[PDB]
A paper describes a structure:
Cyanobacteria and red algae use extramembranous antenna megacomplexes called phycobilisomes (PBSs), composed of phycobiliproteins (PBPs), to harvest light. A typical PBS contains an allophycocyanin (AP) core—two, three, or five cylinders of (αβ)3 trimers of AP—and a set of radiating rods—stacks of hexamers formed by αβ protomers of phycocyanin (PC) and, in red algae and some cyanobacteria, phycoerythrin (PE). Here, we reconstructed a cryo–electron microscopy structure of the >10-megadalton Gloeobacter violaceus PBS, with diverging, conformationally mobile bundles of rods composed of stacked phycoerythrin and phycocyanin hexamers, stemming from a pentacylindrical allophycocyanin core belted by auxiliary phycocyanin hexamers. The bundle-shaped morphology is maintained by linker proteins, including the multidomain linkers Glr1262 and Glr2806, which are unique to Gloeobacter.
Residue numbers in the entry:
A (entry chain AF), D (entry chain AE), F (entry chain AC): 2 to 161
B (entry chain A): 771 to 867
C (entry chain Ac): 2 to 65
E (entry chain AD), G (entry chain AI), J (entry chain AK): 2 to 160
H (entry chain AB), K (entry chain AV): 1 to 161
I (entry chain AL): 1 to 160
């Protein structure tokens, strides 16, 4: 869900009517909004490249890609880059939303268990996410980067 | 389920081809959806719908059997008929469910 | 072929149901590997929470 | 809110947000500040709105506050007013969200069933909401009132 | 299953043909049957009220109904009263049957686990069931009440 | 028994038992005492019914008790008679229950498969049950016989 | 036939024929000429195979040709022999096809249902086919017999 | 589909008329026949396999149909034909209980001719089989039941024709 | 599933090694055994019904299990048990052709113990039945084939 | 492998292996020894096959080894050759298996996606495999070459 | 209509090519067959009435069709069926002389299925009759002619079915 809805939900459980302090948080979000929209468009256009660069930084030229590595074989390689795409798409969604919840509901839920059964290495995945963050940071520019970074970090912490 | 997925007529002939599938359902280790998937991914389905019909008529029958409807619009016909080319019947069935 | 054993709970947020529907709320199921990805997404989109995932059949990190 | 809706459509399609979708998000964030003010106004006037609406409702329906009627007695009358207050709080939440969804989840699903068990008459509840709308409209400026009216109307429609 | 079938099943595992002693147990059930039918009709007619009264006794005017409580929001409130109805209907079925098994097969199985995932409070639910029992006892009358009570207690113990 | 049937239909409809359904239950409980007597009669005559039916069956089908046939030999002939006894016991259970369900679960589901593994001919088994019916009918009074006949007929239909 | 089976699998997968599939086709076409001769041999010996197998079956199962039994009487015995002849014809078709599919459509689908209506015992029919196999094997050369055996075994398995 | 009771109701409902004595008489007639019909249905269900066997023996088997080049040649076709026979029997039993021919029209009769023509199944032979089943059924059910049973069998036959 | 040939291939693939003579020798060993296995499989398929019958006669029938109060009492349970027996036979035949026990693990063996424990089916009796089938199969297949057949039967037994 | 494929089809149908299926298994086991030799030959000549094919590919496609092209530079050229080596290893595995399935799992599923991320041109990769086939064919005897060709063709078809 | 000679010409004309040796050989092939065909045609014309009679005897008559309730029951229907048979024979003879199946498509085959379906004439029985005529014709024409005659009869049969 969304920053706006998160505030509303917190008030609803209290049963409190919306108050100025709450309104201020909502107001803060509204100013940030315009920046976020610009960042999202940048990410969508450069998504393929972002993934490519991040893979180059961490995943490829590594033991993983070499035989006996998790990402060895075309099927596994393709799976890993598909996962990378999802992380990027969901992070973009989270950045627009201004809320980490969507990551929990969509990406984070059931991931750890799936990975453990598969034997996918979590630390390497986290490394890939961090690499994507760095690439994204460049493209989005500094103001947007701070906002983008928190969601990437949230994903990384969840997986770990 | 047999009557939905195959038609009534073909479902009569079934004695126990799917007995193993039935047991997993009886056990409550598979869902009904999964049971319907596997009826779809079956030689009997393929022999009775896929094999003697052109690929468009195959998409009809799949819609009839797995959703209970005809094809609503040309965009939908494109998406599913597309996937039936360039992949199995097993892909079509899997996409609907 | 690899199979996944998945236990997931989905709440009926859109409408209250007169029928008991215990099975729909709480289900343990066997999923083909290929299907699971899509199924996992669908459970997430529904707002259901997947408590447990295990690989029922096959070997993890097997090339063939 | 609108943003949540946009994200959800994108996730279903498994695609990044479309430019058009992004534009709608931009418009919403700009509108939000105006929306916050409208909500703030109603919150401040909340106590009086409820009181005035209650009186109107009781005049419109003598029966509800009669020995036979559900509302009759101090305890019961308080509960009836509490309900009116609840609906007003929901309306404020709606205005800030820009969507009825927040209102809908908390108040409109299973409402019929709940009231039928209570034996409260649903039409009387609807009248109370209508009454609240009229009071709220008077305090709001015309354009603000129209925005608020939509949310009020939805509630009345839901409880029918 | 049913009292009659329960007797049959006990004999079947033994492999014994039906005997007079067995017949006597069946006969006992048949006499009780008429009372049970009358009780069931009473419950069906007053079902809505029974639920209302029980809710009033336990569920409403409580933290649950207040914001932040499990039964807060219309959707949750409606769910709770739906559950209450289920318990009532099944208890009525059990009373006619003369056997607790149906409760185990439908209502009791997996309920605890479902409730824990949902975060529904079991003790409060049990409280509601007990309240329904008390209301039901009044309407059915004393002879019927004893029979009715055991099934309600069975549900409560299971939960 | 019948009552189980009524409850099951109600549960499917998710409704309390209909008055008409309740009336049928009342009728059944009254009938039960008469039904018990009918069952008692057959139980007492059980040994003779089985013996007579067996003889008739063997006359009707010489092959079953022939070197090729399944029934041939003392051990096998005893087993064939034991089977007839089993079916009679099931029929008595049915009469008291007022439904074929008790009979059906113990004897009619998987019967084909069991006998096919044994290689016993199913039609011969059916003839044996028919034979038992005729003997049983003679001992029973006419109205009692009709009631018993229904259960016997069901068995014959099932094994067919 | 082999080729039909391969094509059908490919069409389901929506792919061109796999190398492995193609290889099997190549092997089949080479085998075909030998297969034709095997089929020809059985056709010529058909009359005797049926006769000998019939006698063996009746010795193995006295009951079938007994007043109770289905086969009993001239009309019935002829029909039983006709059935044996039918199955032999199907087996020859199978050998040339290299696959049981031709056999399967004509003879093995609904066979249980047909015979159950007739009341003919399925195991006895299977014995007759087994008997035919033994006769056929003797006339065939060893390698030829093995090929023929597979088709005969399939029939026995099917019923 | 409809049954006799519902058929009367529906006819009255379109007229908007309350139920009248003439209508009541038709309903009353049905109620008396009902008990007989229930007994007949149970007889048919128990003897269904045999009924089909006997009817096939009378018409279908030992014929050109069963001989190669005939419609019922091959196991698959033979099985199909006996399955169709069973359908006719089951539906006729349903109709007899209902006291109305409508179910036959709604399920069996609709599209059957066209299906058969595409398949190349011979209608006259099928009709012959239905008539044969009727004769066998008549015996088992007994005379009072037979008259009732016969009309539904004849209805099927006329439809297919 | 996996077979012998594929098992060798997969071991080499994880190493990344090209196929070597030692590997080739293992493959060659399989190829010689292959012809025998095919003959054995055909024998088993033809005699499958009888194999099950004989094995049941040896262990399952004429026992407490079949007597009332036994696990295989009632037609439904009897039919279930013989269905399970058929499964074991079919899968063992598959395994014998494959030359690998993996298929047994993937289909039959996984979760069977747990299922049986919940059902209350007796594992030791089932194992006894499997061993009986093995003995019957051994006779029909002949000695060379029997050794190969036995290992898969033993594998099933050990798993259970 | 051939055998795996046959078993899988049977299991789906829930039937014992068909005679035709069994026959194909028999043919395969006979072929296997010859297949092993074919695989051995290619393994020994592997280093030269890759080298020769690489050169041919680069001549056929100057662009790939050009500053714009993916293959350009020593590191990249090595990786391109490594890929060719991988595909050759897969082909050898296929020949012994008698089916493309082993090849398919390791190399052909997700191949498009992997190369698209890399930005390697798929047609050029196909040309490299074609080149390898020609080199391999020359070293192999004609019949051996035909068998090897099928697997090579599959790879080319897959990409 | 079209014939063999014209068919070759037309193929060349669309190409714009002058006649070539390969084309000439096809024409030459036809010319040799021609003499046989002419003899066959004369045989068929003389024996046409008998051919129809024999074929009807083989398939159509002494059948359910001719019996009441059958398609060919009543004099009018009987006469229609034999008229149709004559048509098929005449056109097949034309086709045999021509050496081309096109005339069958242009006159007989086009719209026949639809006509028959509206009429309720049974297609399979008609096909049976055509096959019967073929067999009778084969005898009269003699073996060399029979092969040529058979293809046109088969073409008609395939079209109808
Ligand atoms: C040569 C014909 C073409 C070519 C090759 C090329 N490949 C890469 C990089 C990689 N190639 C692979 C391939 C595989 N990994 C597997 O597991 C399999 C299946 C067995 C294959 C075939 C991989 C994984 C990589 C990534 C790097 C790594 O292995 O760590 C490159 C370099 C591109 C880059 O940026 O890394 C190149 C150039 N290039 C062409 O254009 C030729 C036509
Ligand atoms: C890539 C950065 C790392 C990696 C990934 C990897 N994942 C799989 C397989 C799966 N991964 C998932 C994960 C998800 N499914 C979802 O629904 C979501 C949320 C959108 C995620 C993130 C799943 C379900 C699978 C199984 C099937 C599938 O393809 O989806 C593999 C393949 C492992 C295997 O044994 O097949 C891999 C390689 N592993 C690495 O090496 C990287 C560090
Ligand atoms: C009421 C006394 C208390 C209460 C109830 C409550 N229940 C739910 C949700 C569910 N309850 C059930 C239970 C059943 N389903 C069945 O089939 C049966 C047996 C016939 C039972 C008893 C289920 C499955 C659900 C899920 C939703 C559904 O519609 O099926 C809720 C909602 C909780 C939520 O957030 O979803 C509630 C509130 N809880 C209380 O606070 C009362 C004490
Ligand atoms: C006033 C317009 C009418 C009226 C009201 C009335 N309500 C009650 C009791 C309850 N009303 C509610 C309603 C809500 N609880 C929620 O969580 C929400 C959604 C946010 C609503 C709207 C509830 C649950 C109760 C129970 C008590 C409690 O919650 O603590 C009463 C008292 C009757 C009783 O038996 O409790 C009354 C009188 N009655 C009318 O007739 C007016 C038209
Ligand atoms: C007699 C009418 C025919 C006949 C009988 C026959 N039966 C067996 C063996 C068994 N019969 C049963 C049957 C049942 N088990 C159940 O639970 C029930 C329902 C309550 C029944 C009816 C069983 C289990 C067996 C197996 C042996 C055992 O007692 O454990 C045989 C012996 C054949 C054999 O292979 O065992 C025979 C001969 N056969 C005929 O020919 C008669 C027509
Ligand atoms: C002989 C091994 C056993 C036996 C045979 C038997 N069969 C019949 C009657 C029929 N058999 C068939 C079977 C087929 N028709 C087909 O098209 C095919 C596939 C090509 C088969 C196998 C049919 C149709 C009939 C019915 C008669 C007819 O053809 O019109 C009988 C006569 C019994 C009866 O009721 O008709 C018999 C005796 N039965 C045995 O006991 C032998 C062991
Ligand atoms: C038996 C007396 C005659 C006969 C029958 C025959 N029928 C078929 C095939 C089909 N028959 C039906 C008919 C029905 N399906 C329905 O739903 C209903 C109403 C409830 C009917 C009556 C259908 C639809 C089929 C086609 C699909 C299927 O086979 O299940 C055949 C097979 C024909 C073929 O070419 O496959 C046969 C042989 N055959 C005779 O000649 C008898 C006179
Ligand atoms: C026979 C040797 C013993 C026996 C068997 C028995 N099994 C069940 C029930 C089940 N058995 C299975 C097993 C499988 N299902 C599969 O799909 C496969 C793999 C192909 C197997 C092996 C399962 C899942 C069940 C549950 C549902 C079902 O009917 O299959 C029973 C029934 C027990 C009950 O309480 O209903 C029985 C009797 N038990 C014996 O007595 C023998 C020792
Ligand atoms: C008797 C006075 C003369 C005679 C009669 C004769 N007729 C036939 C054969 C047939 N005649 C008919 C006639 C009818 N079919 C109809 O639909 C109607 C109107 C209702 C009629 C009058 C038919 C159709 C036949 C064909 C037989 C069949 O049903 O298939 C014969 C037999 C000749 C033959 O080859 O069939 C004979 C002898 N013959 C004379 O010469 C008498 C003067
Ligand atoms: C005889 C083998 C079968 C048969 C025939 C039959 N046909 C008709 C009626 C018509 N037949 C035709 C057909 C043609 N007209 C054409 O132009 C051509 C192509 C050269 C054909 C073949 C037409 C148009 C008619 C209708 C007008 C007319 O009668 O001249 C009937 C009469 C149908 C009726 O109901 O009146 C019949 C009986 N029917 C059989 O039983 C045989 C299978």
């Amino acid at each position: 869900q969304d920053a706006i809805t998160a505030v509303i939900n917190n008030y609803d459980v209290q049963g409190k009517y919306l108050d100025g302090a709450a309104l201020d948080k909502l107001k803060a979000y509204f100013t940030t909004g315009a920046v976020r929209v610009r960042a999202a468009a940048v990410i969508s256009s450069n998504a393929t490249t972002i993934i490519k660069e991040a893979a180059a930084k961490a995943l490829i030229y590594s033991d993983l890609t070499r035989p006996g590595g998790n990402m060895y074989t075309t099927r596994r390689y393709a799976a890993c880059i598909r996962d990378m795409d999802y992380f990027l798409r969901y992070a973009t969604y989270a950045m627009l939303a201004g809320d980490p919840s969507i990551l929990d509901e969509r990406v984070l839920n059931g991931l750890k268990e799936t990975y453990n059964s598969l034997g996918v290495p979590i630390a390497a995945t986290v490394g890939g996410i961090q690499a994507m963050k760095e690439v994204v940071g460049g493209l989005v520019g500094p103001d947007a980067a701070k906002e983008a970074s928190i969601y990437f970090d949230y994903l990384s912490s969840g997986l770990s | 389920a047999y009557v939905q997925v195959f038609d009534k007529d073909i479902a009569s002939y079934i004695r126990s081809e799917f007995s193993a599938l039935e047991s997993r359902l009886r056990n409550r280790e598979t869902s009904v959806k999964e049971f319907v998937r596997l009826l779809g991914f079956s030689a009997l389905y393929r022999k009775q719908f896929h094999d003697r019909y052109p690929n468009t008529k195959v998409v009809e029958f799949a819609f009839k059997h797995f959703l209970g409807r005809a094809v609503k619009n040309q965009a939908e016909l494109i998406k599913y008929h597309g996937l039936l080319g360039r992949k199995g019947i097993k892909a079509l069935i899997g996409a609907l469910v | 072929s690899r199979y996944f054993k998945v236990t997931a709970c989905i709440p009926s947020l859109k409408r209250v149901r007169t029928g008991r529907e215990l099975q729909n709320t709480f289900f343990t199921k066997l999923v083909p590997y290929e299907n699971w990805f899509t199924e996992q997404q669908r459970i997430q989109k529904a707002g259901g929470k997947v408590l447990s995932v295990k690989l029922f059949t096959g070997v993890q990190g097997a090339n063939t | 809110s609108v943003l949540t809706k946009a994200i959800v459509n994108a996730d279903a399609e498994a695609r990044y947000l479309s430019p058009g979708e992004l534009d709608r998000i931009k418009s919403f964030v700009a509108s939000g500040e105006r929306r916050l003010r409208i909500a703030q106004t109603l919150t401040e006037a909340r106590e009086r709105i409820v009181k005035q609406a209650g009186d109107q409702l009781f005049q419109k329906r003598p029966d509800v506050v009669s020995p036979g009627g559900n509302a009759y007695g101090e305890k019961m009358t308080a509960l009836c007013l509490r309900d009116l207050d609840y609906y007003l709080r929901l309306v404020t939440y709606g205005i800030v969200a820009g969507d009825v969804t927040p209102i809908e989840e908390i108040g409109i699903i299973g409402v019929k069933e709940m009231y039928n068990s209570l034996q409260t008459p649903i039409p009387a509840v609807a009248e109370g909401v209508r009454a609240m709308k009229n009071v709220a409209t008077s305090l709001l400026s015309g354009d603000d009132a129209a925005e608020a009216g939509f949310y009020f109307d939805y509630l009345v429609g839901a409880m029918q």
